[PDB]
């Protein structure tokens, strides 16, 4: 790697994601997740960037950001689940990244479904269905859709 492969890859990839319409290509998700998971030395910066990336951008990017938050979130969750407070010090990092998404996931989901059509809705329903199917998540931690109405009532 070189000095040209710094946070520039994450930003430039998310920017190229915003520059395009339709399609949620996994390559851009791979670059984002790659630079995040490469060393985990940045949490609130990466998280503020993807959340606000969804915030400032159209519908395709609400869905796209849900898939980005999904990959980095699940990867963070497994990586910090593999760790323990008896083998780590100084709170922060991916643990706090998930904790920070935990304050916006409610509006990210509820808007991403309300902005969606039957197809994108069903995709968001499938995303949360896979979260529940994986057993990596539990009840009272997914109410984010402002209760089942959104994609779960139909």
């Amino acid at each position: 790697m070189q000095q040209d492969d710094d946070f520039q890859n994450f930003v430039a990839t998310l920017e190229s994601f915003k520059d395009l319409k339709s399609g949620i290509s996994g390559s851009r998700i791979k670059k984002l997740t790659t630079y995040a998971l490469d060393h985990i030395d940045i949490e609130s910066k990466i998280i503020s960037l993807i959340i606000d990336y969804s915030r400032l951008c159209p519908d395709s990017h609400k869905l796209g950001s849900l898939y980005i938050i999904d990959s980095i979130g699940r990867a963070y969750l497994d990586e910090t689940r593999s760790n323990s407070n008896s083998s780590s010090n100084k709170p922060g990092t991916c643990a706090h990244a998930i904790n920070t998404l935990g304050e916006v996931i409610q509006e990210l989901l509820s808007d991403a479904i309300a902005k969606s059509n039957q197809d994108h809705k069903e995709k968001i329903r499938m995303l949360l269905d896979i979260w529940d199917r994986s057993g990596l998540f539990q009840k009272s931690y997914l109410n984010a859709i402002r209760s089942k109405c959104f994609a779960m009532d139909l």
Binding site: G23, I24, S25, G26, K30, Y67, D70, S71, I130, W131
Partner: peptide
């Protein structure tokens, strides 16, 4: 081909 490149789903982040 598909609308994604490479293909990706909530099944696995990696």
């Amino acid at each position: 081909y598909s609308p994604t490149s490479p293909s990706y789903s909530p099944t696995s982040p990696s």
